[PDB]
């Protein structure tokens, strides 16, 4: 059977599984999974997946969530090359490095700043924003060392990292202080296959999702 | 030679500290001490701009996040697969597990936790709760199986027992979790080097809680 993804567009977790299989190869079929109105709480849902999170990949019975480790499993399960996530152990572990920054820095310090003020209507945190800044800095320089982000060619953990920049792009923070940042994403954009369809669209409708709910 | 930066009471750190011990990997350990600011030296950030631990030097070959040097060294030194399994749906398995300890249970015990003993504000009963939501999807993986990611322990069991071991340093009540309880002692037991690598540092943690709160 096809792979199935239960997933949102605008969830910036699905856009990184979209992205990865695009650029794997890996067709997935597609069940939209909407949260509003608690389709991820459903009893087979929470069967499927007792996390009742998107996204969730159902591989012919294998199931897994987490974003990123959907990802590297597309990648080694069903890649024709490794070049998106290199059998060397050195490359590997720079893509993975950068894959936990993603997480744990990056789309975690937008989250914290921007997620309770669209989701709770909290005010806007500078502070907080403030950190999500930080984070910014930290990939600029990363970027200002070396062509893609965990090294000298596109890989997975690029395309986790557009999906959060384009995200924090959709709520209107303002890139323009990191000029490797802004750099890289153009050449992202070109590079990813299915960039258009897989993430770009998803994300302007977070961003239109953002100025409704503020 | 693979130098470690590191301080003992972090999580991430012991989550290295247990992998190399689990891997077979000696690591000359580098105590960085941070309230003098050591991360922060013109030398330091030229290996690691983000002026973090766990940093691993493997000759030249830098590597920050923890989770990321845990799989470098199974990848590049490992001599036991079920320890961080080849095959990719077990591998999955086991990252996926790895990015719920960072993602949901080391976060949900750092934002209940971090504020109390660094920022003095006092501890949110919510935040505490939402925790315990973790410690829930974490006792459910392991009611059906032996370890966190399947059968055999494996990198992943050794991020969450860091992540546990810091959580019950805090005094955070754990006896609801009986499947947490009943794979806490396993690990305690199955992980090569437990104490050395993990046990002070979680002791020298609660009792730094103890002493800020
Ligand atoms: N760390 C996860 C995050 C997944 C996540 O946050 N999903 C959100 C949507 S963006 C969700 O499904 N929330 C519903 C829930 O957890 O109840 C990943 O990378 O996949
Ligand atoms: N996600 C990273 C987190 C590392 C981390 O947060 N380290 C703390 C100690 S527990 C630190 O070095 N903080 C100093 C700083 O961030 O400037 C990992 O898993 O290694």
């Known amino acids: 059977m096809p792979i199935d993804l239960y997933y949102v567009p605008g969830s910036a ?21 909407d949260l509003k109105s608690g389709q991820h709480l459903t009893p087979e849902f929470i069967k499927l997946n ?12 294998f199931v897994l969530n987490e974003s990123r480790a959907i990802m590297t499993y597309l990648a080694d399960q069903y890649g024709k090359d490794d070049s998106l996530y290199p059998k060397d152990p050195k490359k590997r572990a720079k893509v993975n490095q950068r894959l936990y920054f993603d997480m744990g820095t990056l789309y975690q310090s937008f989250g914290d700043a921007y997620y309770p003020h669209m989701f709770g209507g909290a005010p806007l945190d500078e502070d907080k924003k403030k950190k999500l800044g930080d984070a910014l800095v930290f990939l600029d320089g990363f970027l200002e060392k070396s062509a893609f982000v965990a090294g000298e060619d596109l890989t997975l953990a690029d395309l986790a990292i557009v999906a959060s920049i384009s995200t924090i792009e959709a709520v209107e923070y303002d890139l323009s202080p990191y000029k490797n940042i802004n750099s890289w994403y153009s050449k992202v954009k ?8 897989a993430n770009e669209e998803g994300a302007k409708g977070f961003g239109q999702m953002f100025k409704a709910m503020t």
């Open 190 to 197: 070109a590079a990813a296959p299915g960039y258009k369809e």
């Open 13 to 33: 977790p699905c856009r990184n599984v979209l992205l990865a299989a695009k650029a794997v190869g890996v067709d997935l079929n597609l069940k939209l999974t």
């Open 50 to 61: 007792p996390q009742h999170n998107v996204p969730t990949l159902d591989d012919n019975g």
